[model samples]
Target chain A: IGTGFPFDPHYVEVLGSRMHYVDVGPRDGTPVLFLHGNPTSSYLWRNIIPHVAPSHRCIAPDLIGMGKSDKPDLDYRFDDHVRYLDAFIEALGLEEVVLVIHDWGSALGFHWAKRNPERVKGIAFMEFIRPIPTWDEWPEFARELFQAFRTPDVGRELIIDQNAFIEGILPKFVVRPLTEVEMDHYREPFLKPVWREPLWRFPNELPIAGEPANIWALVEAYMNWLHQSPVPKLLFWGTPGVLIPPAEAARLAESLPNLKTVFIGPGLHYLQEDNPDLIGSEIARWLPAL
Target chain B: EIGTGFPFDPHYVEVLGSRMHYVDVGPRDGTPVLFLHGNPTSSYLWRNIIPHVAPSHRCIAPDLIGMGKSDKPDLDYRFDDHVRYLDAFIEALGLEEVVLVIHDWGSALGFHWAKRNPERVKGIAFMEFIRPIPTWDEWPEFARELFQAFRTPDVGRELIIDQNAFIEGILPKFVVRPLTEVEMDHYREPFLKPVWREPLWRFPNELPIAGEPANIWALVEAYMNWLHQSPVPKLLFWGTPGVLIPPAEAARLAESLPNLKTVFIGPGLHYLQEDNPDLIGSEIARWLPALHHHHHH
Candidate 1:
């Protein structure tokens, strides 16, 4: 419905891959870098950016092999995506930027913020996954599902192009049904078979129950920063977010020293699509305080 | 009867001693689109497309006994049961010379029924559905776990039927296009109570019947053979970048069908109806004339 927003997507050369991004609002405005999650590109921010653009400089970038970005044939590890993001920030010379993260964006964006804590002005979280200290918190099915996605053999088909993931999992992210125009917009980028390589790799990149020693360390550090950070933080939660439950968000908020949380009535993981006005207004109100 | 523009009065007739629900749309004299829906959804799945096809054709969208407005009796919702019930439903309604529109599990059920009565069917249209391939074993570990749960006794009866998985995994995933709150509510209506959702668990167990070990594998093999041999003109509307039934499989099936005509489009998931209904509806409209001619001859 909000298709009229001005979008200027630019590309940055990172590790020989072309990373796509959109820099909105005035250059001097308070810089707010928005990072998206798996199977989605910079377009995920299409509705939310216009609201914040008037007051804040909005930077939304499509990760390599996502959205309008180039799908280079390479390992699409979480670390690799993070590295590309880091390069994008440096190339734009963005500083003291407020980070708005969702889905895998939580891991990728937060990993970088943890590494360079000084450059972050504040943080906004929506349907994000962070490190959990105890295995007791995860349901058996959830645990099993993550383990499968991390496996090498079946992970590509199951996680990448699994029928349920697209039909069931992805839709739960947003509250409303995406229009034909919107669905086409989201589906256009991955039409070619070769373009599907990145889709296949995203699920394979999941860290299984904090296992795989290397990924565990990165997740652990990010979780610690989320709880320990003194930066002003706002949590915009979707009531029925498929991946990050509302209860989990509450638990996360309880642990933070300086946190402001608001639940977006009822939504799936993609709360922005469900109730963008509610989330956008909440963020707008909190922007001054942050 | 339930809705104003519904082509056929919502009716229930006896099928294998069970009451089956269906909407028979369009002129009684016109060719038919026997639409079949997947798990956790019912005849209502074709609500959008039915009206578009009603003026010129008879569109029969049935709620296979266990789902939709159909009577939900406590029974095994296996592939055979679905096929048998569908046969009765069609026979009871005296429907013949039909054009088939199949999706998800509906594809298997519809194809099985068509194979049994090949002379009664006129043409075929497919979207994001698959016929079992003998070598199809690419499911992920987590998927195996979930499918196992669906097959298990207690878990299948208790959790899988009533929990988040069915809604999260089955319904939404089928439609590449998003569903509105109202649409989702409509789908969730029939399964509001545990008593109503018993069939949800039953549907999964039926998969193995069609799996390698079950006697139903013969049926699948026979259907696949019929699919290859049938000369009925077929049209496939495949969702590009689809998660289920990879677009390549659609191409393979189209290649195998003797009288197949295919049009592949971008930006859809398993639920091509939800994602690109307009395009799909248009395709169906364009193909109906030729399909009717084939049926008459």
Candidate 2:
């Protein structure tokens, strides 16, 4: 019976909204921040945190309006989340941080790391979206689906009204069937249709084919930073992944400085669900390298 | 194990009307350590082990024609087909005084090359490789039956091409430890399609068993003569209860062959590299510098 969260919850005021996070382990230890992306929350790191918490301070925060965090009236755009995250990091006074991020969180973490290179320790990423690809690069089937996802009324219908990501897409991509209790936890945050705006906005906000020139510029800046920066980096990918496939992982392993690419077995987008123990173990093993 | 091994950039060369994929790393001046993989496997097999030697030596591992990321040309993929391409590859790279690390059929190819041009090769480090297979009786009972099926015309094609049993069913079983999905996927990458698997299917048949495939059988015998008589240093890494070259057989070879040094790395089976990369890589790394020292003087 999945009754409640495995870790204690903590709340902090950031940008006038109560942000939720799980802060565990030694307060004096090196901070390891975990970030989740669209249609997911801090719950994604539940099993992964225990492997690192004994030695390092583990903090997994739910981005505003997406988890246990307070839902406020806001656009919930990329810049808006960035602003709230910048405030959240500063408010906690976290320095020399190790970022373990996935999906949209990677963009935010990489952006933050690029801005404050000295404060960063290392980065561990999986299924990360970077060096945003041109539309021509996407396969036709995916292109059509994403096109519908980014469309105005269609996006609202697919994500907000129907809750497509949580009910339909998330389960499809994870490579495993979601347990009833686990699905309940994911459904809890956005029970109301209006509360699902952030989920809808996430897919639309993705910078594709340089359409959103503003967001594309930020992604580009960090892409260059990640390649040249000497910071130790660990990239985990799975077989035939949605974002970081084998070929992409190989290219990144070669291009990025001080980087190691780990294959975490059979998985797709939600690799954490497929092999949490392996991911946690790999990060724990790589922690000393930082 | 997915991306942890095989992190080097893939460099390709045009040889024999097709592209060959290889991993070339380390300083330009360091002596070249050429690693050759047997049937079905590519340069990916040596990924984990290459790092240990790359620091002090140039490691060059190629995906043989119609294997790994290399181009798949329409050919019989017989022993002669492989020999021609392998010979052309060495010539094309202009590699000189090469130290070879070989396994399985790769041992056959490497030993043949060394016998032909003894001066070009400095030394050899081998494990679970092709040697004198005097009879099918040399194989264990179960192994004998399995290989017979592999050699049988229709059974071999069905198992290899149609089902891809070598990659899917057989390879992981040969290794001491279990393989992960991603690890299997890398092994499965080249021969995903049945058409791409002819090279894998052809390999088992090329194995000179009971004097059949007489050309390769004679070639192995010729190389054994050179291996026994040559003064070039040789390193043999072996494990207990291996599918081929068990402890008793290894002892016989060690005693007979001149300039041959035997080292028992650890427990393993057919694909020792997968089970003991660190042990093998370090041992090879240790043995290599000594050879260079003797030659430089």
Candidate 3:
């Protein structure tokens, strides 16, 4: 009964993959692109777009192999997502885009927007992994978990064989119990054994190390871009997280001239599910300013 | 409603067969301080301020029924209706030697509650609240527009009945900045329908109308005498550039009050909580410690 997603889904031939998205509202208006992270898709933006799209052009693109988007026969890497995202932006000829991202979407979108800062209007990001914190900043329990996720054999069994990303993390993190139909929407995409490559590869690619071969360097480059650029930004953070504490939020706010941070407390890493209305309304009000 | 991002855990107690939701933060061992709001706001008004005072004090902020997450019942929300619910709420929680932080209509209600159970109250902190007004005839320019809205047929119905004019139109005009969509939603949610919005329309008319509040003005007069006799710790937060408690009235309270600290918190209108949370919060944080130390014995 819960099957109807509000937006009409569309697909565009971007690179080798048929990247899926929901593009709504006035076509001539400034593009507002919402990107999803690991194990989630364009469905994450469902609650958010309705509040925003009436005033601005809204587009939420599912990164490769997730949602209804086509899964190309290739290794899903940081390089892979960045390439498809680049092609997606180029295909649509999107500019001065108001970018909203979470988790790995932040990784991909920030790298692109930083490089093409002139084409970007502003950004609002949350729950994303950024620069590698020093060993002292890394909590020991989280340190072990990241290491285990990085471990070749352990990651394959946990992330691939057991489907721990969808099974283990999503259930525990979301504040409310998602209904069976809602859970079915997220679970159906990664059901096939062959479709599990992207989810498996994503955890192993966690940017704990700032090497060029890994995503940490891209995150650092964007951090530099965040400091130098005059672009407007909004950062949403939950109460207790391994990432983005109040102290870190204060530093970001102090450093960035056009940045303002809002606290949405009593939330988890999957804050979108926990506080969608708060997120949507904040974005709807803030977008016009950008 | 607000969906999520409300920080503290809420505790609800049945007050006259209806649920009244309150944010209960800080230590149970600490001194209990109650924060109350009026006219279209809930405990959400205290969310920002709670983080500051809650460290040292057990801060409690209630939605005052027919507002926020509290249950809305089918009854006329007269002044007595509010007081009855409030009285039941305090007794249910077993709150004693309680400190009160009140605003707007919260002033009329809190003072009346304090006057009834004088021994239960240790202190009071108030801003932009109802003071000693002699009669509706002696009301000011702002007071005239306020009460007239409740009685005027078409204007009153459009304001509180047909659409949420108090929430949508008037409340925003009080604050310096436009409230965020999230902030506005919490205030508007409880009063979405015309039927659910009874309290908003009902409250303004409670100004000694229908011989109902002959006691309320008498209680205000009673508390006016109580203020001279009581050595209770009191703090008055005054807002500049608009609404409710004037500086002259503040000066009158300052002179009458045996133990009172009057502060001129910066610019805002009636809904000063939106603009002055930080200033208000820090003042409470600073002021509460003195109370804690003085009352420690």
Candidate 4:
């Protein structure tokens, strides 16, 4: 909201797509990749990234068409996200990476880490969404919105024609209104039906019936890996609107061995906006313990 | 297990603080064949299969709580929870010398009930369902994820609750031929609402996998122990399957039971009720009297 996004934006060619990302801090410092979920992008991390840049080489990417990244004719599936993120990591020549993931990003991090476990040094996650193999795995009340996205006619009206994901859904996640400047950054990229495919598809990836079993196998494979990983892990939970809030996070804390958790203070689904500084500084403080 | 599919006239009986629905076919004096269908399915799962067996044996299938026309009572639908009502259903109806037909959750619950009342169970037959997971560490990894997926809080609700995906998504996958629209509606209509979907969601949580497996594992262990020593005629129809019991595991159960016979029904999946009801029906009918004659000696 200050004078546009804080970091100097950069782009590089990855798998024929021009991917946009934020790269700051010393070139030699530990590379920390920041990933965003549906309806938000690297701009979602602007207030938080600066806090870690001094000691950690902070990097956040605009996933596919979600932000200023290139909008292609892709169907915007989970395979597309993992493939693009995979290429981005290889292109940057990053290794022994520290991952900071939220929502779908946590799923991507889980994907990346299992395949290349030796490369991931640590993980700090919020609003983590696990790979859901079927629809029965979720609560009935939560399905109304997702059911809309999965439906043909209703999904097109809300996500494509209305651009409800950016216009209607993302804002409510934030506790208050985004300043005009802040609003434009999130809205301008996904203005039309062409730009809204990723939002529509992300919801379908809710991973129920008719969703790919191969992808869920990967979800299950890596989840099994995380329980056994020796690497340090951290989970910061906010509130109910987000995927895994405090009460939910505590249930996970008891099961996971290599993880330590804390209540990171007040927020909602898009907690990145609500507690940017705490989200940043806490990771900065927690990394040393790892 | 009844004569037809939709508009099934199920008989209701008061059992354990809830109204229970079941199909009772054949003469009152005939041998009682108690059929138990699993989550997202009711006695209707046995509709095609029952019509074939009912003429020879007294066929009875109960629509488990919150599924089918059975009363969707307000309670936690756990295995232990259902057992209280099931124990009552058997007692209330004065059902004895029973031949139990097991499928899905019915297999798990049937084993728990039959093993305890070994004298009451004359013989048992099972198709496309869980035997028992003895321990979490020992359970196969993929099945563990599948079981865990249903119990997971938020995602579990999405998969089972909102869509009735268990009925809409999974019920079809079990058999070979695609189900006609009318057949699917019979499965889907019962769970149109979130509350109605609760029983489907609760069924998987009873799986003794992931989290703490000790309690449910013990139930499986206790049943398995009974299965080995009891002279009860045990019949398992192992066919089209998931990352679960196939021919190999089926053999273990067969060898363990003194009078057990393992039969291959042919290629299938979870709800084989859709695939080979006629085959499963005839196979069950022929096997029943043979086990009776073998035990008489």
Top of the candidates by lDDT: 2
True contacts kept of each: 0.00, 0.00, 0.00, 0.00
Task: Give per-residue CA lDDT, model 1, range B1-297, as digits (tens).
Answer: 112122357778888888878887666766666877654345654554566566556667888756656765555444546667877888898876776766545655665565555666555443333322111122122233445556676766555455645554555654555555556554454455545444344444433232432432343344345435555444555655443334555666566766667667555544444465445435544543343223244
Candidate 2 docks with a DockQ of 0.01
Worst 10 residues of 4 chain A by lDDT: A133-142
Our model 3 lands, by Cα RMSD against the true structure, at: 32.6
Candidate 1 structure, TM-score to reference: 0.33
**Can you tell me which runs of candidate 4 are displaced by over 4 Å?**
A1-290, B1-6, B14-19, B25-32, B37-58, B63-97, B103-109, B116-122, B127-297
TM-score of each: 0.33, 0.29, 0.27, 0.29
Residues B1-297 of candidate 4: C-alpha lDDT, one tens digit per residue: 112223346688998778888898865775577878753345654655555455556677887765556666666454556678888888889877776666546765675676566667655544333322222223223233334556677877786777565666555543345556556554454455556555456445544333233554444444345435545444455553321344444555556556656557664544333455455435544543342223243
> Candidate 3's residue-wise lDDT over A105-198, tens digit each?
7656666764665565445443333332232221122333344555669766766687766665554444444444555545654575544554
For model 3 chain A, where is the 10-residue window of minimal lDDT?
A132-141
- Cα DockQ of the candidate 4 complex: 0.01
Give model 3's docking category: incorrect
Q: Against the true structure, what is model 3's DockQ?
A: 0.01
Model 3, A22: alpha-carbon shift in Å?
A: 59
Segments in model 2 whose C-alpha atoms lie over 4 Å from true places: A1-140, B1-297
Worst 10 residues of 3 chain B by lDDT: B132-141
Q: What C-alpha lDDT, on a 0 to 100 scale, does residue B208 get in candidate 4?
A: 36
Q: Evaluate residue A82 in candidate 3 and report its C-alpha lDDT on the 0 to 100 scale.
A: 72
lDDT of 4 by residue, A1-290 (tens): 11136678799898898999999987974577877763346755655565566666788987765566776666455557778889988999887676666545655775676567567555544333432323333222223444565566987677778776666555544543445455554554455455455455444433244244543443344345445544455555553323343434665577655665645544444444555455434443443320
- Cα RMSD to native, each candidate? 29.8, 32.7, 32.6, 30.6
